[PDB]
Amino acid sequence: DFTQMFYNQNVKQFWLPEEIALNGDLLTWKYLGKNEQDTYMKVLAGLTLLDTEQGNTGMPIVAEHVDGHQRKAVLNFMAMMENAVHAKSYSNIFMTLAPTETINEVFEWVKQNKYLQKKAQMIVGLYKAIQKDDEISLFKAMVASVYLESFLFYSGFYYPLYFYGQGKLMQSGEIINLILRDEAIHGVYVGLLAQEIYNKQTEEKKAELREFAIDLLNQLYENELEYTEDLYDQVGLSHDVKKFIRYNANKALMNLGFDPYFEEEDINPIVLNGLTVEPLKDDDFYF
Amino acid sequence: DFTQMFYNQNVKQFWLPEEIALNGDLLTWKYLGKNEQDTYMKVLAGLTLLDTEQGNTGMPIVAEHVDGHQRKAVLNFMAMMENAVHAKSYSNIFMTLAPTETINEVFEWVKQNKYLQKKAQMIVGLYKAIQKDDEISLFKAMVASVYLESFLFYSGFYYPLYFYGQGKLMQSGEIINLILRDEAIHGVYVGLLAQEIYNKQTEEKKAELREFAIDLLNQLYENELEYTEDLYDQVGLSHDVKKFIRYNANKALMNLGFDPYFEEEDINPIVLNGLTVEPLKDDDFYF
Amino acid sequence: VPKWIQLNNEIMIQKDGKFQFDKDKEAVHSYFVDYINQNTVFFHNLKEKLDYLVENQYYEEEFLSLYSFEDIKEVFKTAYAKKFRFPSFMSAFKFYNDYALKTNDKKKILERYEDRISIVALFFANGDTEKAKEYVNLMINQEYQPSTPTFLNAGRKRRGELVSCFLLEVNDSLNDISRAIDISMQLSKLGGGVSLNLSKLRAKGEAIKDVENATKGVVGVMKLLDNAFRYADQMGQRQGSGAAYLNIFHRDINDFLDTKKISADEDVRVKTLSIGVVIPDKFVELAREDKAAYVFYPHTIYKEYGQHMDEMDMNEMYDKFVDNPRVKKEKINPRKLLEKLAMLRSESGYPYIMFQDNVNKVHANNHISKVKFSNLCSEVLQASQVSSYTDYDEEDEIGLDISCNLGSLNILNVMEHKSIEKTVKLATDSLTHVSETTDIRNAPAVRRANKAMKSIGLGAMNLHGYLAQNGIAYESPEARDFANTFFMMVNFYSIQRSAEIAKEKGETFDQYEGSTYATGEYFDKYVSTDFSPKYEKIANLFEGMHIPTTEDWKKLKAFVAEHGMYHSYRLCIAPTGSISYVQSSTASVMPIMERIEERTYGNSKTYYPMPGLASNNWFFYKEAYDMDMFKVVDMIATIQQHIDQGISFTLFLKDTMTTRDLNRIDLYAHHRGIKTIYYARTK
Amino acid sequence: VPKWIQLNNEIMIQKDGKFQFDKDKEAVHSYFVDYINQNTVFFHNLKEKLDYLVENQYYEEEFLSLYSFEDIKEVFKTAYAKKFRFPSFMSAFKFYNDYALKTNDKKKILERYEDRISIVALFFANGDTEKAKEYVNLMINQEYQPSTPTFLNAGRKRRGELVSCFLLEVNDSLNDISRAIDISMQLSKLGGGVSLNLSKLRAKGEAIKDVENATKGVVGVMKLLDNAFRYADQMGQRQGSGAAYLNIFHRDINDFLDTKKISADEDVRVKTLSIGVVIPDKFVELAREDKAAYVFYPHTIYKEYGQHMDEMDMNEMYDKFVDNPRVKKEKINPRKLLEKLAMLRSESGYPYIMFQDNVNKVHANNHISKVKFSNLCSEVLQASQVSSYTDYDEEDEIGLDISCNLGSLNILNVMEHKSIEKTVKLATDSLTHVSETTDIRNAPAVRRANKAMKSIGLGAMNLHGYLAQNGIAYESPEARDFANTFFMMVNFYSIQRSAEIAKEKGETFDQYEGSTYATGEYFDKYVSTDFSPKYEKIANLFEGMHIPTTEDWKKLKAFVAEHGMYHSYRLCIAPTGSISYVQSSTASVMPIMERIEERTYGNSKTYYPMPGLASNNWFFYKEAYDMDMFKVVDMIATIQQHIDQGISFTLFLKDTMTTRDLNRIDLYAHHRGIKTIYYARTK
Ligand SMILES: Nc1ncnc2c1ncn2[C@@H]1O[C@H](COP(=O)(O)OP(=O)(O)OP(=O)(O)O)[C@@H](O)[C@H]1O
Ligand SMILES: Cc1cn([C@H]2C[C@H](O)[C@@H](COP(=O)(O)OP(=O)(O)OP(=O)(O)O)O2)c(=O)[nH]c1=O
Ligand SMILES: Cc1cn([C@H]2C[C@H](O)[C@@H](COP(=O)(O)OP(=O)(O)OP(=O)(O)O)O2)c(=O)[nH]c1=O
Ligand SMILES: [Mg+2]
Ligand SMILES: [Mg+2]
Ligand SMILES: [Mn+2]
Ligand SMILES: [Mn+2]
Numbered sequence A, B: 001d002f003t004q005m006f007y008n009q010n011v012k013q014f015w016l017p018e019e020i021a022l023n024g025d026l027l028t029w030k031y032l033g034k035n036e037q038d039t040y041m042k043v044l045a046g047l048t049l050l051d052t053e054q055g056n057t058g059m060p061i062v063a064e065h066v067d068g069h070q071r072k073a074v075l076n077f078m079a080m081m082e083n084a085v086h087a088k089s090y091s092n093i094f095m096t097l098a099p100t101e102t103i104n105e106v107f108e109w110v111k112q113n114k115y116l117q118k119k120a121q122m123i124v125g126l127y128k129a130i131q132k133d134d135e136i137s138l139f140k141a142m143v144a145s146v147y148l149e150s151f152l153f154y155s156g157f158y159y160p161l162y163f164y165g166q167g168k169l170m171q172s173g174e175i176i177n178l179i180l181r182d183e184a185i186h187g188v189y190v191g192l193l194a195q196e197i198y199n200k201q202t203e204e205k206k207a208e209l210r211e212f213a214i215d216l217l218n219q220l221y222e223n224e225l226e227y228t229e230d231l232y233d234q235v236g237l238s239h240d241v242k243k244f245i246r247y248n249a250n251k252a253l254m255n256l257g258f259d260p261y262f263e264e265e266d267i268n269p270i271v272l273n274g275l276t277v278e279p280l281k282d283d284d285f286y287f
Numbered sequence C, D: 001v002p003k004w005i006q007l008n009n010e011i012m013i014q015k016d017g018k019f020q021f022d023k024d025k026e027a028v029h030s031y032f033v034d035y036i037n038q039n040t041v042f043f044h045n046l047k048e049k050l051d052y053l054v055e056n057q058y059y060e061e062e063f064l065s066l067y068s069f070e071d072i073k074e075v076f077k078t079a080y081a082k083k084f085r086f087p088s089f090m091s092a093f094k095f096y097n098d099y100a101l102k103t104n105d106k107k108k109i110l111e112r113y114e115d116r117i118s119i120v121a122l123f124f125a126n127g128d129t130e131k132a133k134e135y136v137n138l139m140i141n142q143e144y145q146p147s148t149p150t151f152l153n154a155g156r157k158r159r160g161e162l163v164s165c166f167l168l169e170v171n172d173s174l175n176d177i178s179r180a181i182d183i184s185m186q187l188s189k190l191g192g193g194v195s196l197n198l199s200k201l202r203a204k205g206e207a208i209k210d211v212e213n214a215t216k217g218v219v220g221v222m223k224l225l226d227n228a229f230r231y232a233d234q235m236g237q238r239q240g241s242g243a244a245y246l247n248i249f250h251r252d253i254n255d256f257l258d259t260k261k262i263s264a265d266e267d268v269r270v271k272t273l274s275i276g277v278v279i280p281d282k283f284v285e286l287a288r289e290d291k292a293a294y295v296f297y298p299h300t301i302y303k304e305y306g307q308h309m310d311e312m313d314m315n316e317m318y319d320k321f322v323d324n325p326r327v328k329k330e331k332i333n334p335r336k337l338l339e340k341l342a343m344l345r346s347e348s349g350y351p352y353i354m355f356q357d358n359v360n361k362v363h364a365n366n367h368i369s370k371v372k373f374s375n376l377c378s379e380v381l382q383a384s385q386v387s388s389y390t391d392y393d394e395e396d397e398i399g400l401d402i403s404c405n406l407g408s409l410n411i412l413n414v415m416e417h418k419s420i421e422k423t424v425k426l427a428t429d430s431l432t433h434v435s436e437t438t439d440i441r442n443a444p445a446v447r448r449a450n451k452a453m454k455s456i457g458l459g460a461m462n463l464h465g466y467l468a469q470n471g472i473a474y475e476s477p478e479a480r481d482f483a484n485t486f487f488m489m490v491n492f493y494s495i496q497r498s499a500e501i502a503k504e505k506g507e508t509f510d511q512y513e514g515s516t517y518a519t520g521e522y523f524d525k526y527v528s529t530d531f532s533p534k535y536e537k538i539a540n541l542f543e544g545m546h547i548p549t550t551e552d553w554k555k556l557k558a559f560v561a562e563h564g565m566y567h568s569y570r571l572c573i574a575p576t577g578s579i580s581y582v583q584s585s586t587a588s589v590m591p592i593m594e595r596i597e598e599r600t601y602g603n604s605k606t607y608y609p610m611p612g613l614a615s616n617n618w619f620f621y622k623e624a625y626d627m628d629m630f631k632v633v634d635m636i637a638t639i640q641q642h643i644d645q646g647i648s649f650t651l652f653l654k655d656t657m658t659t660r661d662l663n664r665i666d667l668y669a670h671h672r673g674i675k676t677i678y679y680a681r682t683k
């Protein structure tokens, strides 16, 4: 009942980072403190890693196991967006704002950062555990994918949105909003596929799947807290970002057909502002 | 040396089925004989069936085994074009020209056809034989992929190009020309990835891979001749189609860095109509 | 935003449900009082102004010296006696931004409308003060409008050529191709549009000196011509414009048309060269019968028969060419070619279509040559003789290249003044003077043909404006009746003036004796048919004017037989693009494209309602795209029966019209006698 | 695969770790026995063969009519008596694929090497049987190789011109530009390469008839010329090749150079036109001092001084131009321009570099004119005078264009036969005959300059081959000593032959009296310096050959003063690419690019070892890319001191070399007296 409308929405949302000129951010970037620039680079690098794996691994593997040519076409399109559009856009931003050495250093930093490695290990592990014709392993990977789309990106998205909302780094911010617009529909779509599998189960099996989903969310959440503190303490925003990731965790649960898990909190209003030819017949020669 | 350049060329060639209005083809379709309509339907179904294998297996399997983030992104983009753009385009052409019952029957016929099946299963067999961390099996699959993209499609493309060059079925011919333009670049790109593997091999292993490629080409070519007579004798075109197959076989070989196998031939003109700075240091001026 | 622009923009601000058309008079008044009167160089008297203009290399002193200063003062007073006022902002804006003489720094206005008209009249009169006053009255009344080249450049030292239309025949040789490129660059340098006939060039894949598959065809020559026209861009303000014409039976016809496809490769695309196709009746006959046709290799025909393919009658020679083994030909689908032409005209508006048999069945100078191609505007249809440009130190065989200087009658003003005869005769005299004062130093065939043929083009404009301002639909039978009567009278009086000039000068045009004027075959329909209006409403419009009868045409025929004709060609209806604004008239005889013309000049947009547009006549100002193109073809064919040359005929097509509709329009135009089709404009 | 090709491919198959060089003799023998003899037409006698060739429009009967058939038979026997055998497969393959006359269908072979040699000798002798025999002995011994045009076309009815290099001066006017395009097309139609000097054209943004910013500059003319050369591409058998030269001080220099940037837009990019830069010593001096330089607008200079910028002495007039307010100039960075030239040459090999002051400090005909540009191969350096082409019906002021017919001495064969004097004199006679029998009837300046200056180019080839086969390193001082002695002897004997021809004909070249030959300043270094070998090893190479001394040079100077000189220019070392295989020699005086040449002909790959290559001389056959370009510059400068024209000097660069290394090589060549640099080839 939904794939065709998602197909149409995905293809009509198609974009390339080159459509957005980035040289306009040069001055507002120059004006940020060293702490702010550091957090910003690292935040986008963490996002780049997530999209790299979502494009290389997550979306293609889910596409492989989901039945139906139209469902596969949507998932293939989403996969392309992840690595050919989203992951690449971050390099466009980096290449504009930062010198090569700072770019090299931040990519080295993703490799050695323990929270980013842990979250990649956990998410990609679940993708690679999918067994052919085994719907339960597929469900688990789809939960992981929804958590990546609708929860994990948001510790990263906070900062570009926070600046956009203050009228700073607005070209980079425009790119990020386009990425976010895509991930929102990706999270909903994968959520609907996960619910399909969940709804086939016995009540006992469903109870176990909810346990899996909630245990996984909590494990990812605890890691994301440490990641958030590590990045945002130097810019004074860790508590604010934490509220934002809890907000989005609830959206991820809802995409999976589950009740919200965290209590509602006031999000920084700045971040909220950041959001023809026919032949000639014989009679044609007579009048 | 080449992936970013191909990335650029691929994304700038992006298109959607909806861009070409198909209904005006009915004004020339109605004037074709039964044999012409039959051949066109059968050719179209042949292309559709082969392209589906490439979208569901060929491109995604190569993307899976190739190392490199940028290569995986380009390959993902190509897989997207197969599944999201090409497949919808072929379906659109069919739905415009034939009623539902006729489409189902043509696909039943072509699905049972000996020559279409022989080539489809030969290609799919090589994709299924790729082994993790074995570059030889990957190379063999890449050869199969290049043969599909740059050679096997062309016994089929001939007919729409033949009409397109005569002013008949111009809307569907425009679509086919866009598809063909994508397959050409797909073949060239996968060809470069195959040459990379080939160049890492010993001289004895190279000679062995050359023998594999020529042997495979021979098997496919002999089946193409039979496929060609089966479809085109009823419309009197087989001689010229055979010249077009050999010409495209030579292009496929050149994509794989190999010498042409067949002597140069002229092609049907109707089908052709369808188709280190360093600065001077003030001492360089004294001797 | 200037005040006049603000007033003009108030046109579209509807008040009481109706456009405020009266804002244009206010707009023009404010424009004058606030820009033109301020920015006009002040001179104490006419003597000081004329001395300043001549001294500063503005006005040529050759033409002014023929008059005593009293005569010049009298002519200038005659120009100013009318108290001429521009009725709309656009007319005055166009004049004072394109034609009004401005200082070398382009900051001040040296010429008013009256000064320009007086200078043009003095240039025309060639020393005749009374003739100059008659010209001043003719132009100030806006009954006759000299073409943009003549009007802008007349009497100016820096002026370019007063003639702007050139047709060149290209012979099939490297020497001739190089000479054609040189002459095209020379004529573009003068600012005139150059049209070349490529039908004599051998097709691609023909032999050069018994070496086969050596010739590059007409497309290589077209690339050379495109580069030449691009280089001679006339300072770049107006990019160099050239047209290439090819016969439909030429082998390279498909490649010739492919140069205008958007999908065409850049090494084959010809950006700056317009293309026209010459279609004999044989091709239309072949397409009508769905018969397979052949395109011939011109050099094989030339070798077999010693004459060029386009120098022969295809309706008589097609079967012989097909049956001749020594003639090389390849098969084509005539209906497929027609569909390709329609598709190309829809996509880009090209090529121009010339119906050769429609042109040559009424051509008066077939003895000199048949009309083989047209010009860049598609209305010049004259006999041409190719030149033989030989090696250096070898004498050249100079032929005849076509050129004509243009003028337009203002139909509305000519009918209001009831001065068809006098206006036509004065316009003929001015065109003859312009022709006699032209001397092209790098186009030997152009200059020789100008001397020998004395061809002039007298067009007309404001047909639709006049009809709408008189309660007549453009497509209605009454409109065609008026056009028939008016253009019959124009032809009669232009022939009478040509014969009178021949009698006064004692000379006719070269090879006049073999023309249909000399034998009387030209006057058959005029002596046998009455062209008086058949409707009382139309007949009333001509009240006060004598409409020639069959007896008058018999007398004119006898007079021509006695004295001959000075001009080989007299009448051609050119587009009259930008000078129509100055005259506040609709363009040529075409129907108006828009009721109100919205244009952006600088960073301010301006609105130009069609002249005389009002609520009462709003419905009669029907736009061309809303018109039945068959009725437009009927009107143009009615006019064309009295025009000896062609008429620039633009097709106005809706986006919903298929290629079949365009093909049917072209076929109906060919059936109705239409000589050329200029452009396919789509809304 | 052909049997001979399989035998040739066995060359690369190492046996005992050594190349099987003897397989090439077997390859050539198999090639002959299996293809050439089979596909060689059979004629019962020479009389029948000559009759068949003359009647079938293969040979020109006029030149063969000057000999009794007995003399023709004697000449052919002389050619055949040698029993010449091709030493390698590539020599015979190249001859029988490029120069051997074939039937009109290109199926059979009508000429052998002996037949072509005999026909060329009979054409040269112009009716002299003993002279024809001498020419046959010279060519069959391979001591002299006529240029590809002369060798291929001599004695053939359907032949192009025997001269293939032309230099055209272009004047600053539309007539001159159009005439230049026409002449370039006419000359490319003849198969010759055309070089055009664009330094007299005004720069972009100059006034055309007191209207400013009207000029398109040299780039628009470059686009015109590129399209003209593409159109006249020799019937498709060989794409039209042209060269454009611009002085470095021309304002359009940066736009001119940008036409060869890969990133250049297709509108500005020129694809088939080679570009060279003329660099006066003033530019090098400015770059050396890092001073800001100026590029001038040529038309402002012409108006201010009445002369063209390239007609004046830049070294003297640069400061005057900079200080003249009426001369428009643009500030540039000379070192940035030098680095741009280096980078452009690294990326594409362009532009050619002409060091104007190096050319003219030794130029013997500066009274006629300075040398302003070079040819398409950068070895032609002669005085030229620009022509003034006026409007039609006006008289053209025909100037002096440049053209020389080429021939190459085979250095190895000349030294082996100890026949420098005889070979040089016979080559001079043959080149004089070719010049005399040449008449271009569509290039008036070229024809006039050929008749007036009588310029010939006598080149040399097999310098590296001869040195390597004699155990001498190309970069060694001994190689430079040999080159000095050999080319001094060549110059001495060419001057002596020119003086003898002038005495025999009692006529010198136009304006000889003002030349350095007439005043004796040419012979200063020859009468004051000795050029005999300084190394005993080199001196032994000349055993049995008289090396002219200072006394000999004084006697030659006196003889020239008494009788004058027939040729304004005599010696120029052209690249001599295609015929080097037939001669079995290294191309020109350049070092070999590769010891064994790998070529693809069809689907068969052919292997060509350097002529004379073997195990014992492998080290001496050092590849050019591995040599020190400074030593190559030293060699070329040693040779250039005895050549009146230029030497086609290609630079062979490794990919690791930066633009700084290329600039250093260029600056050293300018320091060492190099005149032109042809190509920057990178490995
Ligand atoms: N529409 C117009 N077209 C041409 N010239 C105009 C126009 N309006 C004004 N002018 C020029 O500007 C001058 C001043 O215009 P304005 O209407 O104020 O004149 P006026 O004093 O009322 O009398 P008059 O109309 O006789 O000039 C006019 O004399 C005429 O020279
Ligand atoms: C010289 C040349 C001519 N042409 C074309 C242009 C001319 O229309 C046509 C004739 O060339 P011509 O200049 O007339 O050649 P020709 O007269 O010496 O040979 P022939 O008598 O056989 O014609 O060939 C080319 O396409 N490329 C060329 O290089
Ligand atoms: C006509 C023309 C000339 N030119 C350039 C090429 C010529 O080298 C240069 C001079 O043209 P000319 O043909 O010499 O024009 P002219 O002699 O009438 O003007 P002037 O008195 O100033 O010499 O102008 C263009 O770039 N575009 C053009 O359209
Ligand atoms: Mg000819
Ligand atoms: Mg000039
Ligand atoms: Mn993403
Ligand atoms: Mn996503």
Ligand SMILES: [Mn+2]
Residues within 6 Å of the ligand: B051, B054, B081, B082, B086, B179, B183
């Ligand atoms: Mn596909």
Ligand SMILES: [Mn+2]
Residues within 6 Å of the ligand: B054, B082, B149, B182, B183, B186
């Ligand atoms: Mn594909």
